[PDB]
Amino acid sequence: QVQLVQSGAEVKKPGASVKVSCKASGYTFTSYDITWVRQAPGQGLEWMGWISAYNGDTNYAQRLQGRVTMTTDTSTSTAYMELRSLRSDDTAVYYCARAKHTVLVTAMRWFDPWGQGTLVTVSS
Amino acid sequence: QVQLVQSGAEVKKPGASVKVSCKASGYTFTSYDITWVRQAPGQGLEWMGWISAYNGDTNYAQRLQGRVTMTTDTSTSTAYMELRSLRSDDTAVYYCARAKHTVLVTAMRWFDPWGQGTLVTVSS
Amino acid sequence: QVQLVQSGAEVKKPGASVKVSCKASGYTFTSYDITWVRQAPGQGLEWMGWISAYNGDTNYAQRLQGRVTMTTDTSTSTAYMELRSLRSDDTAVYYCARAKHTVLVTAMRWFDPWGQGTLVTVSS
Amino acid sequence: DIQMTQSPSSLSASVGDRVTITCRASQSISNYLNWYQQKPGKAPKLLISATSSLQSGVPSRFSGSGSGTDFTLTISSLQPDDFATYYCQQSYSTPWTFGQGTKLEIKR
Amino acid sequence: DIQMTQSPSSLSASVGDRVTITCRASQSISNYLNWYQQKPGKAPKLLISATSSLQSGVPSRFSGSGSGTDFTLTISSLQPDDFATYYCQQSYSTPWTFGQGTKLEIKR
Amino acid sequence: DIQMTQSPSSLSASVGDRVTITCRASQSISNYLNWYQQKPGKAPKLLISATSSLQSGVPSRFSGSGSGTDFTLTISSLQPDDFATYYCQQSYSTPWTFGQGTKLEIKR
Amino acid sequence: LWVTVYYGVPVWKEATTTLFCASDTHACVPADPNPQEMLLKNVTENFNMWKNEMVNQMHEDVISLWDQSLVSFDPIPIHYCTPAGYALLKCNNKTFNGTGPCNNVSTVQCTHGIKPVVSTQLLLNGSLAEEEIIIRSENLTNNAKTIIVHLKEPVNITCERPAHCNISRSQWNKTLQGVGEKLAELFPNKTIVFKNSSGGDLEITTHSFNCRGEFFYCNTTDLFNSTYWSNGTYITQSSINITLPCRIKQGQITCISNITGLLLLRDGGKEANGTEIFRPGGGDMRDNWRSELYKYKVVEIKPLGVAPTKCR
Amino acid sequence: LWVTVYYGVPVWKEATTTLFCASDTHACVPADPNPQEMLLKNVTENFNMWKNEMVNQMHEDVISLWDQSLVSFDPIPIHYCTPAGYALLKCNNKTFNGTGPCNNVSTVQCTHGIKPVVSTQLLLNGSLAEEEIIIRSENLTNNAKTIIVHLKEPVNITCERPAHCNISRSQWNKTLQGVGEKLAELFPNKTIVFKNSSGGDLEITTHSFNCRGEFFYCNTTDLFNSTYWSNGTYITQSSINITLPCRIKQGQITCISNITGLLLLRDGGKEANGTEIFRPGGGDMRDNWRSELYKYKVVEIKPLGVAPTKCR
Amino acid sequence: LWVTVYYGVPVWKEATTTLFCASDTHACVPADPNPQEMLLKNVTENFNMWKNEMVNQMHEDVISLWDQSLVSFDPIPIHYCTPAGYALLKCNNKTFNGTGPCNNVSTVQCTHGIKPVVSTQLLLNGSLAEEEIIIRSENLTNNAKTIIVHLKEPVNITCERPAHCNISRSQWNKTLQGVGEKLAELFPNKTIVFKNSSGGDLEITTHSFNCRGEFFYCNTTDLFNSTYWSNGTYITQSSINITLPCRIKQGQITCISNITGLLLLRDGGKEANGTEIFRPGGGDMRDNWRSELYKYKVVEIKPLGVAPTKCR
Amino acid sequence: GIGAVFLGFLGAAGSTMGAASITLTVQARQLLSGIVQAQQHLLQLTVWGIKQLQTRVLAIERYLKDQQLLGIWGCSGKLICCTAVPWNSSWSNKSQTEIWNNMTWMQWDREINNYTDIIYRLLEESQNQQEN
Amino acid sequence: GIGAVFLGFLGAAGSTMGAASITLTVQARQLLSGIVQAQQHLLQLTVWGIKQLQTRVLAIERYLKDQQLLGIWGCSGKLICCTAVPWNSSWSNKSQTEIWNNMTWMQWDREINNYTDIIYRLLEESQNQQEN
Amino acid sequence: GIGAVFLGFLGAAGSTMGAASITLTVQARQLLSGIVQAQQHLLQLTVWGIKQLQTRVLAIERYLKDQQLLGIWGCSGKLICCTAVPWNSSWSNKSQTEIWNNMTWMQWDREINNYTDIIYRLLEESQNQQEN
Ligand SMILES: *[C@@H]1O[C@H](CO)[C@@H](O)[C@H](O)[C@H]1NC(C)=O
């Protein structure tokens, strides 16, 4: 029912930009937030950030100073995530999920559904 | 179902004015008339008058020359009756009822429902 | 259900004009055409013409050069046929029918319902 | 003006007895005449209209009769819930005058 | 213009007999040809379309056959309600000319 | 920032054995702590929320316990579909840091 | 010698239900173009019209409809249909005055197209009773019950505001002669005299009726004050047009209608003499419906039955 | 030696009902995403497609839909479902020409997604019959019945108005070769010759079809006049694009489609010779539906049954 | 010695269904003004509230309603009704903590007017439990389960934005004394100490609640840090108005309410000592419904039964 | 489809018992075997069909109630059923033949309407005693 | 819920009588025990449900009609019922065994379809005579 | 009209078997004999009535299913039915009197809930064997 569909795996040159889409189905996209998390080849999941599909507020990780830009499209209910200034350590699988509710925010504090993930590989 | 609710019993000074309300429920207030009748302590009911809730026409008793004013409020469906220049003989219980229909007026000629009545007492 | 009702039988003077009506019931009058055919006392049916109830296009017989005028009224769904410059051989029974569909025109090529017919008699 | 004159002022009888109340007019009023029953404290209620032409009430215990200038309300059997004053009201002409009323007592 | 020529002008037979009406054209018209039955006084009615391709009528008593330039209407058994004149109409080209008709009599 | 420290890095056991994973915090986080199970290749899925307060999942095979600064995930019996890495995530404060994870092997 | 239980016997009971309206707005259920009328030979049913519930139901429906509408309105035929398990009996006897026994009973599912028309002193646009004149009442001895006169033939009424209200003189005179002879048949001797209303207000005195737009209150006393002596001498007191000068209460319109019913009332003369004075009355408006609802009653099916036999 | 009444035997009868429409506007009932298909082993049912009622029902529905719509419209899949107490049989034999017996019978509640498409001389967007080429007709001996050709593989048609209408030459030539060999198999000897329409108006002569917006009347005679002799020598008379110059009747749009069916007609040559001339025809539009309704019939359940046994 | 089949025995089973909503927008079914409550004497039913399905159903309904609405909204009473063949048992024992056995069982068709209110740390506008204080939990030994405190008497809360949020000091002190004595009764010895939230964000730390328009996040630590020693010495640390300075998240309005429930949580002190520290918590919002749904369970009727007797 | 039976129930109301008992089977069987079928105006179809559905459901529950009542006695679903309760002369002393070719069913109903409840109770209790 | 039975009625259409009579009880019992559940778009729910309600009511009245037909004979509600009408050889002289393991039900229907009405009348009249 | 019976089914849940078996007939019979009845707001009547119609139809099909289940055994429509299957002591050795004035129905259900399916199968197969 509720599902998030991502874009295909991309390979990009160093110093370029990567744009990844995430389409939501089975629920009202305007009634939740959308977060993104990356897993590098190896072990460990690092939280990039989340953004609100209703207010439009964004909150990113502190390490990602300004290399990350995140937007939504309500009509298509699709979240877009943009990473600039790629480094050699940026090769990872990126997953899009929903963070919590917008109003009833003190109860659900989990990333319920997850997308298949998009593999972004940087190399020369 | 159909019921007329009056105001509480009032005591007033001589020469003052008394205003009594009558709220109608259970039927279309605009499809009938509203009449008022007083009963003094003792015996006898004296017809004061009636007024139309649709046209707004009023018809009062001849003895009550101009001491009686009668109005309706359609939105609240409430009839208001106002007596000025009270005399010592004006102490009585006042009842509000409906007189007849507006269109089919040659059939029903009775005061079908009656309110609980409001006791107006004048004294010094 | 579907029926065409004509006007009464008329007698007209030579050189005059005859106007005959045909009312349609039981179907959408705008979704078909209307044709008229005359039968003289004796034997033989001669096709006068047909007209479209949607586009308004008309197609008459070649012998009837300009003596025939044909119109429709959509609101009353009634077809009117007008013959001027009557000759002594114009005495006949006129029938109104429907020709075909407007869109699906390659399938039905028959005059399905017919009216009772109107007898037009010319004499001095 | 047309006057309403009820024959009795106060009568007493026993339970089940038949009591007739006569109401008279100074002018002919055809068959337009209603009856009201007033219990002590409570407002009077309609019981017979135009000689028993009501729509929902009229339990099979009251009856009305008469036309012209005299009218009669008749009970078949009195019951304890019948302590009241009865008034005859005209509906012929704009002066819808009431009767002075008859108080009915029941003996025990 | 294309001409319609019905082989018979008037024929008589008995009840239950099989009567064949032949209608011919001066030009090939493929399979576009309808038949009309006209009772005396009443307007003619459609009975067979494009060699029996109707939607509601066609009782199991009439039949049509033939293609090209000759066509045949065949009855299986005549009945008293069959006194009429039959006309073959073309629908190939704008001149939708009718046949002069064949009047059918039934002998008794 | 609040750190997530999972006691085991990799453990192996047999089918039906009970495996306990201990996750610790540098600061008290009350009872806000979720568990994620990541199969190889597939994205991790929620399995226990706030010590088993989910709405539809939680099959009767996992359990959570503990409060304050230490928490424990307990299995009742391991099954072949349990090859995965388990991560404990905090939800107390904006730094929703994850655990480095524990890979669970099953011996055969 | 033993009982047997039959499911299928034709037994009915005289209970009452809440029939539902039908139309051919509150809206109603469908009105079918066919009757299930089936004559029950060899049976007679004891009818009664003064103890009907349908009249009260239709009075309530008319009151509700007039409340919802509120000028004027267009009345429509209204059928009444019974729920499953019930039937509507119907009487076919033509001289049936309204009560008492009946023959030629026929069962039906839904009534005919009644018209909710309110009028005074003249039942307009009503159904026409066949054969002869019909006189109906509740208690004829009492003088406090309105007498309903069902007419055999209609009389045209044509009234127009420029206010005129025209009737044919000869036909109305013949109709009054028929009414008088029928009433003299019903009232032994006691030559009948007709009079106008006595002293009512400008609303009860006149004939009040409704048509396109406005309300017509019409002074009818110019078409009364006739007499009918004992034997044969009904004699009244110009042109075949008889006109009513009358007033309008809330142009160049005309509303035609039929006069098919009369609402008379017997004056309480008290003294005997040899005359009975009748004046047109009113008061009730349930009589406007009772003219076409005097033959319908509702019956409840009771399929089960018991009967003794030699069933061992 | 005594009868026994079984309630539950699997007995059906071949009556007909009024099936109701279903959709996945007049609107219809729901269309479920599952079949109740259950194969009935060890049974053979005698089918018939020329005596179906569903075709007339769908013709009426299409006529009503086109009347309501009136440009153009978007067709939608339409399922047909049977009322309670009935079932839809279905034939699974792949070489089933349309009539005669059948095997592998399967029962169903609702049909598949039929598309109400009207076209002439080329059944566009139709369902694709598998295995081999299918030839169907009512009375093959008669030359007054249109022959329906169900094709194994689709042929792309691509037509655009700037008017051009393009087909692949090689695939269409192979398809015509297959049609010719199948027809020669059906017609003993009598080398087949293909010809265009003879003398119809500008409406019947050409291939008339509907897509976005307008009506396309297209002169097809440039893709005919081939021959198929007895043994193997089917030979026709440039570029793989074959284009149809043709007209529009009531821009830069393209409507792609498939050619999955042919509507041929046998010329009445009368004289024998050794050739049979076929020309594309038309006339009926019930054949546009009969290509996907040749395997469905409606059956009525008759649960009760009687059988003798030793039940004492 | 032989079995007998009774259709009519009063036997129920503990299955679960999908109950349907009722109202006195997605809309619901009617809510009747009468209960079918019938006391079942001489029976005791083993209840359970932590294994209910109605709570999940109402959580889903509340989530759907909030999604549809999206400010703020007006909650309405919502009844829950069971389909045909099922009943809702109800417990009447007043000291019923939520689980375990029960007496005075009464069967019902539809629940009462539940109000879908979401609040933290203070159950506002809830139903008032009678008699005494009620303490409920799932596993009291564990310190990871929120403790629900059902209060006997309401405490008025009055909060206004010019932001102030006012409580009566004396009544709240008495209420806390009652809660402390009840908890000391439940917890042998181990003098209880109350504390505020420790280190949550600006959303979990404060008491968050909803009224007209906006969201109120209110710093509650000024009304805590009390103590309850073993014997009788509950002592706290001005004016009867106690005010909460607090913030608004998305004038001159006032939303009054009642404090009828507490959501406490036992700190994991690990070390024994002689004190148990309690802090108001939250997390789940299914507890907001469980306070008025602790006595309703759904049962399935199984009319058929078998029993042995001497029926030959 | 089903309710109309209750209206066709009255066809033989005039005939005597002899001619009414014979036709009962064909009457009931042929009666029940009655095989038969802007946007504001489109909305009106629903209120058209709701009333008809309510009528059909009412007929169905009436049938079910009456069939249960029959089944309580010693008659499961049969029409001309038999019971073992003796017929005492107190209820009616009229001979068999006169009632069986001279008295219509309703006349019998009116004659016996005072004693029907005793008959019902006796039937039910005798069936219960026979079962035990 | 109920109508689907009439569609599951055809599961054993291919088997012989021997394998079709055995499974009848479980077939019928498990078939009937099928336990299961802008504003313009909101209006559409009513026309969604009206058709389904009509279908369910149609199935119910079909069931009631057929059950009454069974009850007229000597079979109240049973499936494999028994009757006392003798089976003459004129209707069919085929032996019991061949029809009972070699002939499907429909083949028997086709063989006997000409004589079914006489069988129905004989059953009903023999039951009526036995009752009297 | 019909569904409410299933809710009145629980009136005698507390009484023993002796006082529950006696009142069964009057309970069932009196329960089933429960004789009783802008434009956007006008649309709402249809969705009012659809739910009630669905509930009534659900009750009707539950009744029909249970009645068929009863009819499969040797009980057509009767309430206190009888069957010829012997009662072995293995199912329960408790004496008749204790269960018949001391044990409520539900206590018996809980005691015997493990053996009910064997009882159902034995009843059905014994009825089938007796018929054959
Ligand atoms: C509720 O009371 C029961 C006594 O039957 C007890 O066993 C249970 O532990 C109590 N639960 C709570 C939460 O107080």
Author numbering:
A (entry chain I), B (entry chain J), C (entry chain H): 1 to 52, 52A, 53 to 82, 82A, 82B, 82C, 83 to 100, 100A, ...
D (entry chain N), E (entry chain L), F (entry chain M): 1 to 108
G (entry chain E), H (entry chain A), I (entry chain C): 34 to 57, 71 to 116, 208 to 299, 329 to 359, 361 to 404, 410 to 422, 441 to 502
J (entry chain F), K (entry chain B), L (entry chain D): 514 to 550, 561 to 655
Quote the study on this structure.
Here we report the isolation and characterization of a CD4bs-specific mAb, HmAb64, from a human volunteer who received a polyvalent gp120 DNA prime-protein boost HIV vaccine in a previously reported phase I study DP6-00126,27. The HIV-1 envelope (Env) spike on the surface of virions comprises trimers of heterodimers formed by the two Env subunits, gp120 and gp41, which are the sole targets of virus-directed neutralizing antibodies. The HIV-1 infection process starts when gp120 binds to the CD4 receptor and co-receptors CCR5 or CXCR4 on host cells. In a separate assay, HmAb64 was tested against the standard NIAID VRC panel of 208 HIV-1 viruses, and it was able to neutralize 20 viruses from diverse subtypes (10% of the panel).
We, therefore, produced a single chain variable fragment (scFv) of HmAb64 and used it to form a complex with CNE40 SOSIP for cryoEM structure determination. The 3.7 Å cryo-EM structure revealed that each HmAb64 recognizes a gp120 protomer with its epitope region overlapping the CD4bs, resulting in a 3:1 scFv:Env trimer stoichiometry. Unlike other CD4bs bnAbs with their epitope regions compatible in the prefusion closed form Env trimer, HmAb64 recognition primarily occurred on the side of the CD4-binding loop closer to the trimer axis. The overall epitope region of HmAb64 is extensive, with buried surface areas of 656 Å2 and 561 Å2, contributed by heavy and light chains, respectively. HmAb64 engagement establishes extensive contact with this conserved region through its CDR H3. Our cryo-EM complex structure revealed that residue ArgH100e in the CDR H3 loop of HmAb64, with its side chain pointing towards the CD4-binding loop, likely forms a salt bridge with Asp368. However, since HmAb64 was induced by the gp120 subunit vaccine, it is not unexpected that its binding to the trimer resulted in a conformational change in the local structure, such as the displacement of the β20/β21 loop of gp120 from its position as in both closed or open occluded form trimers. This displacement thereby pushes away the V1V2 region of gp120, explaining why the canonical four-stranded bridging sheet conformation observed in the CD4-bound open form trimer is not present in our HmAb64-bound trimer. Moreover, the cryo-EM structure also provided a structural explanation of the neutralizing activity of HmAb64, i.e., its engagement of the HIV-1 Env trimer is more compatible with an open form conformation as its approach angle creates steric hindrance that prevents the formation of the bridging sheet, thus explaining why HmAb64 has limited breadth against more neutralizing resistant viruses.
